[PDB]
Amino acid sequence: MFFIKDLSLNITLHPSFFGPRMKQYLKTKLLEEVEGSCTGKFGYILCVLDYDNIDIQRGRILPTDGSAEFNVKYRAVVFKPFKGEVVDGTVVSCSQHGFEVQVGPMKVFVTKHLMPQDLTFNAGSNPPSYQSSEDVITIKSRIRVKIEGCISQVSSIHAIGSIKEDYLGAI
Template identity: 35%
Template sequence: MVYLQISLEHEILLHPRYFGPMLSDTVRQMLFTEVEGTCTGKSTFHSNYSLNSPRYGFVIAVTTIDDIGSGMVQPGRGFVLYPIKYKAIVFRPFKGEVLDAIVSQVNKIGLFCEIGPMQCFISRHQPYPFLIRFLKKILHSRLTNFFNKFSIISDDLFGFRKGTNTTMAIFYLVLDLLKTYHSKEYCVALFLDLQKAFDCVNHQVLLGPSI
């Protein structure tokens, strides 16, 4: 991420009502309005960088206006086109560069970030949501059938499959505890909750009758 002073070009399309003694000032003011705060412009020269190909950046501020060319009347419209050469301070991120950003807003469609003077929007939109859901459904169905066919997943393993969530795991655990208690037998249980999967279960509802 760098800040550069580069030479840029821009064209101002001026309405005939602005023709008058303040024409030059009007052209300058329109240049400031149209280019500052935008990502536009072709770079033609910079003293510290070899920019042989067109470069673009976020124009922060116009520093100098080098030349205002002769206006050309547009046929059939009456507007006048002024080519302008100027220098400006630009903010220039490069492809593949890692930048620090401040997240300013998060909503259901994506998030907004501030990277220096620029604002960036990162969308959560999936280009082919129906196709993705369809492929996920097929993949899940085939994997489930494969695991069941070769008994890869034990019946005592809960999770990853429909109808075998953590709530059902605690339900069967309570049944086993009650059965052991009424049979006056000993019971030992070992809990390994690596992903905190049981935190979302209402334990009071499930364990209430057995307490």
């Protein structure tokens, strides 16, 4: 998991910017668009690596308007979750239906039913928790989750997780 990928974006510049701070503006636009971006193809496009060596290439003049299109070849850190992947995250939200574990830029949700029977919901607690004979899972809690599946929603990826199997759960 957590990958480095060799991507490329196609930015179109308006003639007004055909000055010297051209490469500068293009590089910035790249970060504007691509950094913090989230696709399903590659997942979360987190940090654009090697700013100094971003390959601008030559920009082709688009015919009837005056603009120029560039293929900006780059390299960056991505995070694309997978089904069956084991993650170690921190509880954020927790309800009568289950808790939502924060794993990097993405949240994994554990269903009351994807946890062992021994773990029961406790409404009568500040903050709300899940209690067992031994373990107590509330907000700040750190958990080992098995990603059961992912849902590629727009500007994010969500997932459902299990803590029911072995070596999984509270850590």
